[PDB]
Symmetry: D3
Subunit: 149 residues, 6 copies
């Protein structure tokens, strides 16, 4: 009854040195780290990640902002795809609810700290793009009996 | 002009070792600790606590999950019965607002960390069930002039 | 593309010793401290600060509550006037959204920790009232490239 | 291989509203809450608590400062009697090591936030003074396999 | 029985946006903010501040690093001159004790976040240099009875 | 003038869900994340990691405790090998200084949350064991001018 979502800390999260705070927010709910890797995003991989936006006039500047260190992550939990989006908040930080990552940390959409999958189909596509199968780890949280009903 | 409400940290709050964090959230608003007791909740007392659910099909499992260590608490403040419910958030953590206890810590309704009274009537009944009158402590917060208008 | 707002920690924020926590919430979004000054507010400056309420029955007691230590602040950021208001929350803490300053720290409107300008015109007026131009400091945040689009 | 120690938050800890923060420090090490009770300490019980200081010139003032709300606590862990003393720090906050409770929160010995048992013998005596045996709760922490070797 | 010390957040503390965290550490002990002002340090004022080091070969680069925004502060407390130095930790962060500001935040002496007076004579000299008399505020903390013995 | 050290969060750090808190402690000093990978440690790689203990009676049980999820990390900074060891604290949590990871989170050596390289030679060896060169990411922190001399 759990699912997995792809979450990626963008270069502003790395450079503002809030990686640990971001991870703690997801651990706090008992979400399980199933995969985690630091890499440097490149244009070719970002073009695939943002394939839906191919040709749009904002894409080159988006790719420029995203070319940098990122933390690739997979978290597992109940309804975690939708819940992670809720926790990140609106794309535009000024519209995001107090208590969300983007409202608490950010000002503008082009520097909004973190990416998360928007659907089950996107999560599968994004996890496959950024991770190899060996990098997804299967284990059980010891506090499961107190996290899940 | 203040009220008192009954708040109970459920066994998942004890076992996940977030008792202090929960207490701090209520202290942060200048709510006063009027009573506090660790006990182990048993089926007979839980039957009385959940008396409104007598006969319902979910009550046996509810009593099972709640059989365990709990922290019984009474907090005092302006409108604290309704306000503590707002702070806990929706019964379902997935529906609760970011910034609430259940949204920040939990995933499912059956493991949602904390109980709080839903009304003046329930608060009076619940305080009387879990505490003797001699366990309720009266004192004044030194910062009262800066908390209350 | 940034603006500046006037934020003032009221005597209750000073006395409850949460100045640092308040400042940290604005720093966390990459808002820039452009001015900061501890002073003891006088009725004379408070009458002008609250000029919009001249002749109202609540004004004498309001000035009385505010005659004490305050931290005058100017913060700079994108949309910071409206955003700081959002972060403070509703005037009445009980109506404010979880995750806002007033909801997280306070109980009643008369002791709601902080003031922030309510509009661009009010911000200009309030900054000029509490600060001389030579007290407003211009510098660039080193993380600007990761905060702004 | 575990021990139990008596820890008491003194009236300054209650009044400064740092109870949760104190509890969190002990929970953070995987120490188990075995008992917890808010009460108001009275001279007669404090006379027994401080029996070793019978007849000393400072005892009357010590009893006066301690007359007030307190949080009685029992924590269980490996070597927890000595370890809780290390965590509290020196009696004089000005001599206590950074990172200890008294160094982080306090200024003077007479307002040093917290009491903890100084030995196995004192722990047994103090637990018996402030708690009846039926108030001491036995349960196992779900994360025991990752806390204890 | 209290004294006052001059503490100054250096430009790295401003630019790393840890001002609020620094202030919170001193508020946590019940130290009173007696003065606070943001300014931009200039070579002429820094030459007076660092007058003891006139002519030394490191001074020009020190002044270069310190030319930037700073937060001037006066904190009041028992033994606060010595205690603030202890809380900052060793000049060289690698030698500073865990739990001190410099150990927790910094790497090298040339970027060690904060300055504090080394003596009563230095505190008077530094407070006079960076503050006007009007900027030092006299008021009493409401929690005094629980901070001071 | 910086170096790199190998830091590994052990299965207890994963299961107690304090990964974010651990990372934040190193980020707080301006240490740079150069590599990061979640994996499940195998006896084969653990035998090599712990090669210095081949033939000792504790090694089988050590490998057993460590066969589980781990977060492999490389952090970069001035003197970071020795400094990270200082931040971890003594092997035995009860001997570790307050404010260190082991003293703040742990009770016993066999469950002490984290591993760090003990020397420059061990760091080079351990980085090479757990990471391929292509996994080590080179980038500059935008705050470098405020972190380094
Ligand atoms: N599965 C499950 N559902 C619950 C539990 N507690 C409440 N619910 C359900 O959650 C819904 C939302 O709760 P409400 O927001 O109405 O208090 C209710 O209609 C109830 O059926 C629980 O412990 N487990
Ligand atoms: N349907 C359903 N409702 C529940 C369950 N547990 C609790 N509830 C509802 O949620 C309310 C809040 O639960 P409490 O926090 O008091 O345990 C209860 O008073 C009851 O109305 C459950 O297992 N199933
Ligand atoms: N009715 C009423 N409104 C107030 C009072 N204090 C503040 N307000 C309202 O809230 C706004 C915020 O002003 P602040 O007091 O936060 O600087 C005021 O401009 C006014 O509209 C009060 O005592 N009574
Ligand atoms: N003024 C004052 N001194 C105290 C208090 N408690 C302990 N002391 C003193 O502080 C010294 C240091 O305490 P120790 O570190 O020996 O436990 C003792 O010799 C004792 O005289 C207190 O509440 N007030
Ligand atoms: N001289 C002195 N010692 C004190 C005073 N209060 C406490 N102490 C000492 O400090 C120890 C720890 O104090 P507690 O935390 O138990 O109140 C006491 O057992 C006693 O030895 C005081 O007012 N004066
Ligand atoms: N005697 C003993 N020493 C150990 C044990 N585990 C770790 N150590 C020591 O502590 C060091 C840290 O290794 P770690 O286990 O933290 O990766 C080891 O290289 C070894 O010196 C153990 O089970 N027994
Ligand atoms: Mg306002
Ligand atoms: Mg090690």
């Amino acid at each position: 009854h759990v699912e997995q979502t792809y979450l990626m800390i963008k270069p502003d999260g790395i450079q503002r040195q809030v990686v640990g705070e971001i991870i703690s927010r997801f651990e706090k709910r008992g979400y399980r780290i199933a995969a985690m890797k630091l890499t440097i995003a490149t244009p070719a991989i970002l073009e695939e990640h943002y394939a839906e936006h191919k040709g749009k006039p904002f894409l080159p500047g988006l790719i420029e902002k995203m070319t940098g260190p990122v933390l690739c992550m997979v978290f597992e939990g109940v309804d975690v795809i939708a819940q992670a989006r809720k926790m990140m908040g609106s794309t535009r930080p000024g519209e995001a609810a107090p208590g969300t990552i983007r409202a608490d940390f950010c000002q503008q959409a082009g520097r909004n700290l973190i990416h998360g999958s928007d659907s089950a189909e996107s999560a599968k596509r994004e996890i496959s793009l950024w991770f190899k199968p060996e990098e997804i780890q299967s284990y059980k949280l010891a506090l499961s009996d107190y996290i899940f009903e």
